[PDB]
mmCIF file of C-alpha atoms and ligand atoms in Angstrom:
data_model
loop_
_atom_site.group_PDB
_atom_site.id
_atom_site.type_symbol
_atom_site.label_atom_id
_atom_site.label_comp_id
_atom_site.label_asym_id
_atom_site.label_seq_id
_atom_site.Cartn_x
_atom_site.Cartn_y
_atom_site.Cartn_z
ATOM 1 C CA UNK L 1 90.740 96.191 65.961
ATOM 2 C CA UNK L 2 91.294 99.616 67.531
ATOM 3 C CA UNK L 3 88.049 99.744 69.886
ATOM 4 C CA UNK L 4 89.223 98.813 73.186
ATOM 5 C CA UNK L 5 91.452 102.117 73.241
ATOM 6 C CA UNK L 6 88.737 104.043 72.274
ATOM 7 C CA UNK L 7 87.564 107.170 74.882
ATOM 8 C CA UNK L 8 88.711 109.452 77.486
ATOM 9 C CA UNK L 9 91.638 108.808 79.251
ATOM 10 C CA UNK L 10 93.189 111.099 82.244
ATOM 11 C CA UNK L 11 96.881 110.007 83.260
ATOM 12 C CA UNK L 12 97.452 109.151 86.585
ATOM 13 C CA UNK L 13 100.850 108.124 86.553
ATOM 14 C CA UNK L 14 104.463 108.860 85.154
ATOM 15 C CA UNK L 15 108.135 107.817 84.629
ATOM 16 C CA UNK L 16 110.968 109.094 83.076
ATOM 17 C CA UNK L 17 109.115 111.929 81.045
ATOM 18 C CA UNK L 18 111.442 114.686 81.898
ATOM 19 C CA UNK L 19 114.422 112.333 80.563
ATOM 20 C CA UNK L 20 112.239 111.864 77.141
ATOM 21 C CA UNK L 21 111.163 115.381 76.715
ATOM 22 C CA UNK L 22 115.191 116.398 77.395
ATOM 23 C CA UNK L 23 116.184 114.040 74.569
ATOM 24 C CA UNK L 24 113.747 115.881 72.262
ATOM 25 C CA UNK L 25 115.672 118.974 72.937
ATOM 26 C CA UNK L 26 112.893 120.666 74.970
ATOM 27 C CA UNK L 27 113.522 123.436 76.990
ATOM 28 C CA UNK L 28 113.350 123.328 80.971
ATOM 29 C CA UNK L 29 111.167 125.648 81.770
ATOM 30 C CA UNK L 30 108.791 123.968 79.122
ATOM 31 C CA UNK L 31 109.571 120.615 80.930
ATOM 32 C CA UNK L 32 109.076 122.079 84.308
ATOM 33 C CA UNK L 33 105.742 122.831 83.307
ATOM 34 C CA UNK L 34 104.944 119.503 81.578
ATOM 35 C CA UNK L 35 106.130 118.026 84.563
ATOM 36 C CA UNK L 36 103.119 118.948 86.693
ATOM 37 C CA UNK L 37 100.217 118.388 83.852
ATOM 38 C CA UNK L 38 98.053 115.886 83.837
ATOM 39 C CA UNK L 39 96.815 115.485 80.536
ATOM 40 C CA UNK L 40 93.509 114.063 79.112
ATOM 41 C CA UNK L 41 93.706 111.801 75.788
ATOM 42 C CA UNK L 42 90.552 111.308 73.617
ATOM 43 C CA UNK L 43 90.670 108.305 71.105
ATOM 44 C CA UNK L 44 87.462 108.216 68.468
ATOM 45 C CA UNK L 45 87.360 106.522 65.349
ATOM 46 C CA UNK L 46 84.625 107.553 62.128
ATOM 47 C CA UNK L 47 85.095 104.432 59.556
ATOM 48 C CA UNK L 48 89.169 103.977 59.479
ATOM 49 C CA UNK L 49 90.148 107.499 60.684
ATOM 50 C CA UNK L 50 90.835 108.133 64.161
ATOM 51 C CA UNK L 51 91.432 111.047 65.851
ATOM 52 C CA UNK L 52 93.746 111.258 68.824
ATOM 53 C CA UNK L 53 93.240 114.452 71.276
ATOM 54 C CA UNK L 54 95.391 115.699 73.971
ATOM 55 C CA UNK L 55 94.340 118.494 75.930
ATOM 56 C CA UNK L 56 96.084 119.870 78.831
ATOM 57 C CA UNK L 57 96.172 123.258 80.648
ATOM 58 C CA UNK L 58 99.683 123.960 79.095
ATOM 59 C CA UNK L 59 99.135 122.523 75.399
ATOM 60 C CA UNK L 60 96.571 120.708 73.372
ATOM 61 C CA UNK L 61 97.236 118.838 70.257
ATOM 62 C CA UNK L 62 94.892 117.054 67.440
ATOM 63 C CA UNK L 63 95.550 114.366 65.108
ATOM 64 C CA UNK L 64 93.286 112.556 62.549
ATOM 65 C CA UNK L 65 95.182 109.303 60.745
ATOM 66 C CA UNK L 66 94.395 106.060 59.092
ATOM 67 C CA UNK L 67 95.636 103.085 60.568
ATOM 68 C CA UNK L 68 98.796 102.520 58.302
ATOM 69 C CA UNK L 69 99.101 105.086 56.192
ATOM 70 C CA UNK L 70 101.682 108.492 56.440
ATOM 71 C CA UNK L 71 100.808 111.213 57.845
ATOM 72 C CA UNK L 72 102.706 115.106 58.728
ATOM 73 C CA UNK L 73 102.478 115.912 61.879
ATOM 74 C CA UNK L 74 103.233 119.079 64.217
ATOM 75 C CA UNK L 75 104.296 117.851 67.720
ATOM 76 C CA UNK L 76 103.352 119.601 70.610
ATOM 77 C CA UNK L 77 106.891 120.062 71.123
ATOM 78 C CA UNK L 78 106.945 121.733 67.647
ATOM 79 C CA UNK L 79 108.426 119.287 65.545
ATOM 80 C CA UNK L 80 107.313 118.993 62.116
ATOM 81 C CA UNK L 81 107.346 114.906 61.677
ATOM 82 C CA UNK L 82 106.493 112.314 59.427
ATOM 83 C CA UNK L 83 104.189 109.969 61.323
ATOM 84 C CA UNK L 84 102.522 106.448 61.133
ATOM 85 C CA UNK L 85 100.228 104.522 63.305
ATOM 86 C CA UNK L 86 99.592 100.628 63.249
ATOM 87 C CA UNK L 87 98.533 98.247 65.428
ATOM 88 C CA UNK L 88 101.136 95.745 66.493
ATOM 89 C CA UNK L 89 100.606 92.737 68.621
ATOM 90 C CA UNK L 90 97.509 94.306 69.837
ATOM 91 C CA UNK L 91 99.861 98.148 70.880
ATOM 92 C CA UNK L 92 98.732 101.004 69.093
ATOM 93 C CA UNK L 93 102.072 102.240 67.199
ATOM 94 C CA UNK L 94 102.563 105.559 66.401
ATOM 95 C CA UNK L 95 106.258 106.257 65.041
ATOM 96 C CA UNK L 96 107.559 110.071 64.309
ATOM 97 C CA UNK L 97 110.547 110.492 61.789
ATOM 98 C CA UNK L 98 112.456 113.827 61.295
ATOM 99 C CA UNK L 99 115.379 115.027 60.378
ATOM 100 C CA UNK L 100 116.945 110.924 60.352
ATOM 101 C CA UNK L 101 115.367 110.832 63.921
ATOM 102 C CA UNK L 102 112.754 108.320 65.082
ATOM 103 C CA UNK L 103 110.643 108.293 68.470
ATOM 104 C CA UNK L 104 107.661 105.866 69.115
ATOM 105 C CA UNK L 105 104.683 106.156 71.180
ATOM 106 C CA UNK L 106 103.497 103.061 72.169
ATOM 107 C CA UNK L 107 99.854 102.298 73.543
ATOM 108 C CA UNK L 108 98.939 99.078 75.241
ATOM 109 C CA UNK L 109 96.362 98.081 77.480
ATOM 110 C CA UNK L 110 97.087 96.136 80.229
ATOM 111 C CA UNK L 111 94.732 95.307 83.408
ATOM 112 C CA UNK L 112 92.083 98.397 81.871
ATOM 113 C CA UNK L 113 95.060 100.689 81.936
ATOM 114 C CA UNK L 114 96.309 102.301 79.222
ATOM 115 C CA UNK L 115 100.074 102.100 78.671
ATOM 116 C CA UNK L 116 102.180 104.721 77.068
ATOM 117 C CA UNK L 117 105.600 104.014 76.490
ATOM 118 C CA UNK L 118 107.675 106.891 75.087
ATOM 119 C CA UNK L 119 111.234 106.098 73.378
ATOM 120 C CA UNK L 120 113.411 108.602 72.048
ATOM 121 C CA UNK L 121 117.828 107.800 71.830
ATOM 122 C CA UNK L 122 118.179 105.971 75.171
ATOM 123 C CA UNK L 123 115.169 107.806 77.157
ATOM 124 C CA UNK L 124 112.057 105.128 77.691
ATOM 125 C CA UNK L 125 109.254 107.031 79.409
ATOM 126 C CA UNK L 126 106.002 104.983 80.768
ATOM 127 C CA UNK L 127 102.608 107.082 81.436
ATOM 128 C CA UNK L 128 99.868 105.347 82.704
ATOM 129 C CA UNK L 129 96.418 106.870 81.698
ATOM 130 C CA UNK L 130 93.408 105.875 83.603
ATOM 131 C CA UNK L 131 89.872 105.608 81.713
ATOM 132 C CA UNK L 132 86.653 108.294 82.073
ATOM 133 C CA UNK L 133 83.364 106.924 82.070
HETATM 134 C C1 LIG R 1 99.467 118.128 74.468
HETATM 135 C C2 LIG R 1 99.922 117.758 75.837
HETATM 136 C C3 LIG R 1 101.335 117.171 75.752
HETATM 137 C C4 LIG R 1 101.805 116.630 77.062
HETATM 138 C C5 LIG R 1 101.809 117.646 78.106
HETATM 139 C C6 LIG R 1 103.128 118.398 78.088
HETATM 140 C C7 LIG R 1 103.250 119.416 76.978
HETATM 141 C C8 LIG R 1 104.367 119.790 76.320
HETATM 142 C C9 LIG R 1 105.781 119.297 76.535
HETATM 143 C C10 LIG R 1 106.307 118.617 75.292
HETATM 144 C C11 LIG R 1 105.694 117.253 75.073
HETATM 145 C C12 LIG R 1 106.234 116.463 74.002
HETATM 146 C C13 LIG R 1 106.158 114.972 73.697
HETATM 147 C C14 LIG R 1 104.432 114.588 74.017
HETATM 148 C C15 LIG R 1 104.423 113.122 74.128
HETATM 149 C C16 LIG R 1 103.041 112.632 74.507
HETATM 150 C C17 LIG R 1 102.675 112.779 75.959
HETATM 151 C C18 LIG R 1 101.320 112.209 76.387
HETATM 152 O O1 LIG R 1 100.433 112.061 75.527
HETATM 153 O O2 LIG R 1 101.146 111.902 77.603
HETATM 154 N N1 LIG R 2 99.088 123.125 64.450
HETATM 155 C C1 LIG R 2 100.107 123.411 65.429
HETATM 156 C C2 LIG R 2 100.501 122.121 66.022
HETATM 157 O O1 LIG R 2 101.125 121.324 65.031
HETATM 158 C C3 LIG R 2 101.447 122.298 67.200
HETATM 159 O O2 LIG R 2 101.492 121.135 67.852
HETATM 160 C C4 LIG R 2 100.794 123.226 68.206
HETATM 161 C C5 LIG R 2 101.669 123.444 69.435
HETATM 162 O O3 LIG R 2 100.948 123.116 70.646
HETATM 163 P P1 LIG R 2 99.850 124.205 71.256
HETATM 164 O O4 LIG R 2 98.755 124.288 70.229
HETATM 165 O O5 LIG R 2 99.389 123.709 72.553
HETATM 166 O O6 LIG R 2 100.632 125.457 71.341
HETATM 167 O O7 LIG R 2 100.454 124.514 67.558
HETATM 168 C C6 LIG R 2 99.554 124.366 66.437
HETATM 169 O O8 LIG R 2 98.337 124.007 66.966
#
């Protein structure tokens, strides 16, 4: 149900993360830097795990989750969260609680592009990853 996100994605476009990473508290020299990275996002599945890379010259993070069920998480921002991921009329939903706080990360494809949408308070942030044969 999963497959179609499945591989290496580079993103090639961005709006609004510097207003999303502010919400999150994040520092400005850290968002300077985030600013200018172009991450690449690797999406494999073994049975009902998947594991969700990100891997930039500035940070990398890892995650391995089952569709549906809780996971902790350590953001690359450093928060210490308690995640889920579902699939939801066809998005891949991952939502992050802390602290009473939510954000979601929300992947859809559209046109062989995937989508990330970003919402955190008021902040909605859309990248645009591109996929790596
Ligand atoms: C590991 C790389 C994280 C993105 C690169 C910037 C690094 C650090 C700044 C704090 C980011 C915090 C929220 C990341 C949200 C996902 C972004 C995405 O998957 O596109
Ligand atoms: N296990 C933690 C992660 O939970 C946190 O996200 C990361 C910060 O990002 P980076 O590894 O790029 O410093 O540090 C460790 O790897």
């Amino acid at each position: 149900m999963v497959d179609a996100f499945l591989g290496t994605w580079k993103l090639v476009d961005s709006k609004n993360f510097d207003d999303y990473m502010k919400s999150l508290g994040v520092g400005f020299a850290t968002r300077q830097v985030a600013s200018m990275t172009k991450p690449t996002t690797i999406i494999e599945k073994n049975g009902d795990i998947l594991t969700l890379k990100t891997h930039s010259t500035f940070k990398n993070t890892e995650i391995s989750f089952k569709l549906g069920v809780e996971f902790d998480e350590t953001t690359a921002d450093d928060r210490k969260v308690k995640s889920i991921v579902t699939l939801d009329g066809g998005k891949l939903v991952h939502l992050q609680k802390w602290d009473g706080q939510e954000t979601t990360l929300v992947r859809e494809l559209i046109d062989g592009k995937l989508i990330l949408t970003l919402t955190h308070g008021t902040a909605v942030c859309t990248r645009t990853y591109e996929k790596e044969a």
